[PDB]
Write a protein that binds this ligand. Structure first.
Ligand SMILES: CC(=O)N[C@H]1[C@H]([C@H](O)[C@H](O)CO)O[C@@](O[C@H]2[C@@H](O)[C@@H](CO)O[C@@H](O[C@H]3[C@H](O)[C@@H](O)[C@@H](O)O[C@@H]3CO)[C@@H]2O)(C(=O)O)C[C@@H]1O
Ligand SMILES: CC(=O)N[C@H]1[C@H]([C@H](O)[C@H](O)CO)O[C@@](O[C@H]2[C@@H](O)[C@@H](CO)O[C@@H](O[C@H]3[C@H](O)[C@@H](O)[C@@H](O)O[C@@H]3CO)[C@@H]2O)(C(=O)O)C[C@@H]1O
Lengths: 579, 558, 581
């Protein structure tokens, strides 16, 4: 013809192509007096035979492979059976004839030389269907053209989609996360298009997934099939949200549109996915990542019916990829590492409990007897611990003063650090009817350690939901900094430090307290210990590159609690500069 | 904090969605006036109950106590049940809907000093819930997608139980009674599930018969006589029930909620209640019940705020409720222990059927050639006979002047007595197009008897009556009473004027004087005192007050 | 007492028969405020078991065979499952109880002797179903009669359809045609009835073909199972319209009717067919004919719910079209005629060699490189050729200046004659993007022949879409006639004739030009080949049917008459050329 650019091209001429001569080869219904006729079909293996019209340059295999590279793979989609139907209601005291015809997507392979198409192979792939209806009287003459098409024709507007044939800081604790990135995900270039129905004005039209076969094709990518295999990811999905069926479904979706009396209507259906990510996060880095696109329940676009004789505007294909047509969603859900054993405290912790550690990382499942602030630590505050909440423990099986296991592997990090040589203790509000997981990290000592739990009825409640770092051995002048994993916005980190010198209760020293990268509100306490009381000294201290200085009593213990208000870096570096 | 010490089994209600598992089976996006229909089918694999035990309350204890009072969910989770929702996106928005399983939340609680000390929980799968939101290309609230704690989308319930440790005037024979449809067991023991249908949306509960099995419920007083198989046969005989453990019959319940009302719809499996009895001399000698799986019951309530007042209620007693309309269809059935002999010629004006020691009882199938009054009797009017009409007979195959067997075992007693030693004859209007069954009783004579049929064009008017022959002349004669407006007659010959007193004891008498023609002499006889000729007379009696199974007739001479 | 006397009769008492006693043996549903209940079933294997009530003269086998001969075959229909449902909506603040019951068609076999029915066998064939509903309160007892029927009864009006038990000129070229005679064809009586639903006022009712099985039963008649066997016809159907499935379908049809609130309604559903004819047409005659009734997607008749029973005799076996009128005539390549190919697109001139036998006919597939009028002929214009268009060709695979085979055997006759001994040439508009078939007939000459194609940018374009007969014959005065296959109304036939005598450009002869049976508009040209050839227009709107007008034409001069058929009264058009002095 006359086109543009030299070489071979794969082209999608669009959906809605009906073929010549074979209009009534499926039959039609006659409906009389106000009755509604519903005609439809079910495309499967057998009825989804495509029609190849090759050329010497472009054989069937070449046509197939190149079309399925860029566009919907119709050899796998002829597996999952899809239905459609049309519904016309005859008027009173007059008859109506409607007949059904398959629609096709018309793909082409073209050779272009000097702005001319020299060769064209065509492939018609079965899509859905089109019903045409007429009202008729006994021996009313009907136009031959109503029954019979002499040339291939698109009932929709045609398309010319071609391609030349070349031939963020995550403040997460270390561990596994399963993230729901949302629903309504389709691939580009209609690789997940179900089909299109032209719905004549006054008629009605549906596109159906009846699950006559109970099989779905999830989409799985992984960075390491050894660590994150599909089976493993499915388990994490089970752990995270309790997904059961992955390659199966009993769940039906249908889309239905009734065209008004005055105007025709068009409806396009897609298979969709719900996008999950499984990540392995370590020290600010995604060490492994899989993507699981779980077969969902579809997307449906309803447009007014476009002139079948419109201007065909040629467009180049998009890059392989996804588009979310559903709303935005991020659900981050930690999951118990299955490489890490779970030990159990069968007693609800009341005022005091001491768990003896045999001496490889592990979780400890436990609950409290009474909602309250608990201090938790190992001996000498080494190693550093982490505490997670099992998600949705509350309001199931209960027994006063005893643990009931809900068997929840979905964990919600509260506070704690992954630094086995840094001294810390935890101060957490624990809820009586929840379960919690303590995570004990890997240690290279074989010395019998012990985790200690203590109910705090005092001022240590001000450190609520915080790990407290123990800062040893400040010198009497100069700089000091302390890099740790930053909490998220509005989460907490605390630091317990003793001012240089001997305690006189009069001699002070000039301390400057600030962060380096992240913004934080700092509240400062002075510890006075008889049997911990915290005196609040300043709690309006914004820390990011602060220069403010406050004189603190020498040889006296203080605790700084910091609220992250701007997460600019994975780490939070804390400066304590002394004068 | 509640009331009363001990252990309790509790139904917290249907409509519980679980935490974390909200979008676990996908959702649809619909754009501009398009309607999305999403649905699922609860079946073996996806219908997993979730036990949350406590030391006092094991899984077994939880199961057994919940299935004692409430639905047996281990038999129900086999039969596949469907539900769907239909939401229509507006024009000026897109719409995202996602589907989630609902559960009934049962609990076992220990109560001490007006306080719950221990709670085990059991989530039994019910149906499903769709949650939808309108959106533009925007941050949606975390809470829309993700539930952190278990929650009821309906209003919750607290249904608990403390955990401890007239005259039937029927002839002797078998009856199959339809006691009606819409029978459910109590406390939702036959509940399918509940759908919340938000206003403007639509909701269905479906029985598609993806499996054909149904689970009928059977009781019997004697599994020897009335076994299940036997009862099924009687059901076949009575009403022609064919499938007992199967059905191809579909039921769906569908509601489209208005814009103004959120609607709630509860579906139950129902039963049709049949009774098979053996009735003898006013008494039910044996009785089975067959609850035939029916096509369900659908309760529509206005949807109550999910944050409503929880009113604690004690369970009802084990049993049934009829939610369908009340019904009694009594249908006699040929005793299958009793052979059926045939008169293959249509009875004309006269016919004599010859019968060959204990001559176990038997039926005789026959028809007449002309609609008319027939006198029927055995030799010397012994034994006493009964005549039944086969129900709906002879609208089918016909052959002029011959019997066609329609194979109808469903019989409708007309008249006759169950005293083989009392002399009587029958006077019945017979219809040319019907079949009738004569029932010949057990006799201890081996003497060759004969049943005689005679068309009566005149006099006999004793229509639809048995006539007792009184040979043996105070005197009393106890018989099975006819029903209100049915007849019983008495023929007596006296030593031979004389003063006769005629009255009944427990339960209108027309009196005739015989000469083969009947002259009408006299037109409440219960405890009558009226009286006033020796030498033959016939009394016809119409029961108007059925107070006793029996009618005793006094004939006192003075 | 009845009139049909002396013999045995098969009788259809109608559909809508419910049986006594067995009304609620399937159950029912209770629905409360506003809810809609839908109950239904699907007739198949076990639940489509008929109830035979025979008599000595009429056993089950006799009853079956004689009803399925005249009426629906229920043994073939009971395999393909048919569904129905009813939908009732309970009002607000009120309960509603509906129960379901099978309906039957009631057939009878009767013996009649001397105006008297002396024997009757009855057969109940399962049809669909009926739902009966009532409003109630939970406490209430409802009347026995609602739940329970003591005698067989038709819920529709009964019927008595009985039968005594014994024991247009087609202007088509020669070749095969497949004609679509249209859709919505049912057989007579109710041989194709699916069933009837009585739909209570305010309720709703559907009849469903869900294709739980795929099989369909096409209906085939043939005049010669040797020539037109079913398999052969199926091929022709494939060739004509590309029908693939004949005995199967995945295509669903359901009918739904909602009865108004005051009046009950009835809907009858039928299986329908689409009627195809395959004919072998030769010289105005259908030498062979098969009929193929392809299973379609049904017919749905909605009538008011009705009565006096009128006895009526069955119709003759046959079809009734309830769908709209349709005639689609589609020629098909005779498969007993091989296809030769011109693999290069024809330019302005091409010569295809076709040597000779004393042959079988054959086709030649070719396309042109440029849209235009082409003159096509064999050497000396013998034999006569025919040209067909392959229908819907060349919208598909394309290659510049080459033929692509689209494998289209569906052909659309343009022009040409069968008479293999009449000299002629073709003048046709050919389109660059179409394929065409030339058909070469059987000849008894062994002469090495050639077909010649020439693009005509001349006056010969006025003969567009016409065969031109050569009359070399006129050797003298007198009468002459020329019978040919008539074109259709508004199609063309042309005649090129040389007037007897030597050309002097003065001496004329008186020629009278007329047709015998068909009316035609005749345009007459004088051919002048000198410098170049022209057509000079001599006479313009001549209506030729039994014409008496005469035109003195130059002797030994060539003329061409183009004729437009306007009234097709005969298959043939006989052309008279009567010459005088
Ligand atoms: C003024 C001063 O002494 N600052 C130093 C601090 C403290 O020694 C330390 O915070 C006490 O716990 O340490 C600093 O550097 C550490 C920082 O990068 C953290 C980040 O988590 O890692 C520490 O090293 C790890 C090491 O990577 C592990 O392998 C483990 O075995 O040893 C330690 C465990 O904590 C860095 O030493 C700091 O900024 O916090 C800077 C000065 O070294
Ligand atoms: C004046 C004159 O000769 N007219 C006669 C014409 C012409 O001879 C002829 O049409 C010129 O081509 O022929 C007429 O009869 C022919 C006509 O019936 C055609 C049918 O279209 O069939 C012819 O015979 C065929 C025969 O059927 C074949 O088997 C084979 O032998 O070829 C011949 C061809 O001639 C008839 O001759 C006519 O009406 O057209 C008779 C005229 O008298």
């Amino acid at each position: 013809t006359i086109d543009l650019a030299d070489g071979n091209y794969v082209v999608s001429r669009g959906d809605g192509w009906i073929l010549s001569r074979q209009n009534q080869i499926l039959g039609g219904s006659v409906i009389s007096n106000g009755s509604t006729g519903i005609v439809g079909d079910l495309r499967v293996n057998d009825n989804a035979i495509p029609y190849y019209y090759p050329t010497p340059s472009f054989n069937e295999e070449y046509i197939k492979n190149n079309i399925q590279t860029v566009f919907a793979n119709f050899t796998e989609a002829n597996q999952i059976p899809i239905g459609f139907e049309f519904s016309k209601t005859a008027p009173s005291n007059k008859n109506l004839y409607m007949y059904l015809q398959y629609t096709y997507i018309r793909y082409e392979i073209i050779k272009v030389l000097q702005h001319e198409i020299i060769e064209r192979a065509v492939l018609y792939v079965p899509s859905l269907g089109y019903v045409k209806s007429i009202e008729f009287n006994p021996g009313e003459k009907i136009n031959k053209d109503f029954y019979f098409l002499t040339n291939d024709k698109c009932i929709l507007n045609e398309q010319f989609l071609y391609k030349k044939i070349l031939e963020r800081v995550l403040p997460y604790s270390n561990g596994l996360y399963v993230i729901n990135k949302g629903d309504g995900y389709i691939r580009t270039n209609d690789k997940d298009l179900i089909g299109t129905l032209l719905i004549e004005a006054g008629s009605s039209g549906s596109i159906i997934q009846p699950r006559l076969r109970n099989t779905t094709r999830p989409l799985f990518t992984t960075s390491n099939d050894a660590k994150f295999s599909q089976q493993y990811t499915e388990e994490r999905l089970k752990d995270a949200f309790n997904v059961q069926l992955f390659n199966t479904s009993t769940s039906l979706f249908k889309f239905v549109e009734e065209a008004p009396s005055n105007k025709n209507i068009c409806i396009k259906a897609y298979n969709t996915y719900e996008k999950y990510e499984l990540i392995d996060y370590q020290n600010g880095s995604i060490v492994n990542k899989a993507e699981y696109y779980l077969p969902s329940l579809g997307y449906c676009e309803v447009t007014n019916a476009p002139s079948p004789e419109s201007e065909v505007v040629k467009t180049q294909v998009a890059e392989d990829g996804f588009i979310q047509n559903g709303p935005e969603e991020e659900i981050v859900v930690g999951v118990i590492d299955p490489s890490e054993n779970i030990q159990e405290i069968n007693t609800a912790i009341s005022d005091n409990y001491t768990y003896n550690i045999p001496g490889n990382p592990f979780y400890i499942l436990f609950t409290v007897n009474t909602t309250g602030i608990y201090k938790i630590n190992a001996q000498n505050n080494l190693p550093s611990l982490k505490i997670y909440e099992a998600i949705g423990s509350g309001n199931r099986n209960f027994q006063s003063g005893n643990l009931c296991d809900d068997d929840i592997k979905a964990i919600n990090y509260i506070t704690g650090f992954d630094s086995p040589n840094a001294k810390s203790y935890l101060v957490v509000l624990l809820n009586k009817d929840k379960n919690y997981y303590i995570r004990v990290p890997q240690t290279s000592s074989n010395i019998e350690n012990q985790i200690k739990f203590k109910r705090e009825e005092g001022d240590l409640r001000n450190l609520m939901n915080s790990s407290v770092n123990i800062i040893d051995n400040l010198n009497s002048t100069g700089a000091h900094y302390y890099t740790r994993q930053s909490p998220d916005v509005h989460d907490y980190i605390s630091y317990e430090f003793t001012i240089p010198g001997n305690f006189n209760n009069k001699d002070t020293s000039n301390i400057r307290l600030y962060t380096s990268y992240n913004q934080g509100i700092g509240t400062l306490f002075r510890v006075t210990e008889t049997i911990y009381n915290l005196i609040n000294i300043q709690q309006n201290l914004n820390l990011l590159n602060s220069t403010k200085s406050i004189r603190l009593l020498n040889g006296a213990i203080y605790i700084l609690k910091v609220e992250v208000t701007e997460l600019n870096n994975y780490n939070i570096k804390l400066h304590i500069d002394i004068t």
